[PDB]
């Protein structure tokens, strides 16, 4: 796993193994992040609503 301990975007918190965030495009990926959540269908996800995510995938609640 639920934590770092895949990098998390410092701007939108999406978790990726790519060299840039697919959601917002940022290169600001952190190795230090906590509390993984998974969103499969944004429109039908309570955790998406809670965190404001608009693209499905894995997100960290906390990113340093
Ligand atoms: Zn991002």
Curated annotation (Swiss-Prot):
Zn(2+) binds at residues 9, 12, 21, 24. One of its GO terms (biological process) is regulation of DNA-templated transcription. It comes from the Archaea. One of its GO terms (molecular function) is zinc ion binding. The keyword Ribonucleoprotein does not apply. Keywords: Metal-binding, Transcription, Transcription regulation, Zinc. Pfam families: Spt4. InterPro entries: RPABC4/Spt4 (IPR029040), Spt4/RpoE2_Znf (IPR022800), Spt4_arch (IPR007178), Spt4_dom_sf (IPR038589). Stimulates transcription elongation. NCBIfam families: PRK08351.1, RNAP_arch_Epp. Contains a N-terminal zinc-binding domain and a C-terminal NGN-binding domain. Belongs to the archaeal Spt4 family. This is Transcription elongation factor Spt4. It comes from Pyrococcus furiosus (strain ATCC 43587 / DSM 3638 / JCM 8422 / Vc1). The gene is spt4.
């Amino acid at each position: 796993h639920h934590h770092h301990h895949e990098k998390a975007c410092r701007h939108c918190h999406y978790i990726t193994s790519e060299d840039r965030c697919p959601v917002c495009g940022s290169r600001d990926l952190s190795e230090e992040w906590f509390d993984l959540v998974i969103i499969v269908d944004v429109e039908n996800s309570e955790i998406a609503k809670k965190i404001g995510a608009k693209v499905p995938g894995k997100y960290a609640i906390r990113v340093r």
